[PDB]
């Protein structure tokens, strides 16, 4: 049951065609995370391939793949495999499910042991000069930047592995810093970014009541307010001030 066959089956989404895979793995002491079953250059797995081929948010090969991986006795769970090349380093199936805008797939991955804090940190995902795909590296931060409120709340609230609002990326950026980084003057985008920022804070009020999320400094010692100023994001800067003063006045 070779890699070519496997990648074909999972791309077409026909789980009946996985019959015999488990037995093959078990007879030959192989796992789906082995180099024989990944694309050499990137470490792309059959699970990543499956999530890349969602249709209406689903791929009926996903749960069977997870189940075969578990039954194969794999000590390095397929669900948490990450890309290995310089460009995609750290990208996981969970990241792809979020990129594909599939809450259903997110839930399936999370219920089956997906690590919600894996960092997509390769060059494609870094802050650099010009147009970036920087979203703060973290599944929560990705879901927030791509404006996926239902994914955000699920990541925060799920009983399996809740994502931490305090988690930071390779820059020391929280989701709040990531949002500042993608703020711009698109009136559409700006409103959505600000409402996401507020919704996260409201969630944090309940989920981590004693933590001042807006006081967390990144690797350059910048809070989201100071970052907004530095990056020239005037609208969110003003919003952050307005929040601070309205919050103090409400408490006073």
From Swiss-Prot:
Residues 1-247 are cytoplasmic. Residues 1-247 are annotated as: Required for interaction with SLC50A1. ANK repeats lie at residues 1-41, 42-88, 89-134, 135-170, 171-219, 220-246. It is found in: Cell membrane; Cytoplasm; Melanosome. The modification Phosphoserine is found at residue 8. N-glycosylated. It comes from the Eukaryota. Ubiquitously expressed. Expressed in dorsal root ganglia, trigeminal ganglia, spinal cord (Lissauer's tract, dorsal horn and dorsal columns) (at protein level). Belongs to the transient receptor (TC 1.A.4) family. TrpV subfamily. TRPV2 sub-subfamily. Calcium-permeable, non-selective cation channel with an outward rectification. Seems to be regulated, at least in part, by growth factors, like IGF1, PDGF and morphogenetic neuropeptide/head activator. May transduce physical stimuli in mast cells. Activated by temperatures higher than 52 degrees Celsius; is not activated by vanilloids and acidic pH. Homotetramer. Interacts with a cAMP-dependent protein kinase type II regulatory subunit (PRKAR2A or PRKAR2B) and ACBD3. Interacts with SLC50A1; the interaction probably occurs intracellularly and depends on TRPV2 N-glycosylation. This is Transient receptor potential cation channel subfamily V member 2. The chain holds residues 75 to 321 of 761 of the full protein.
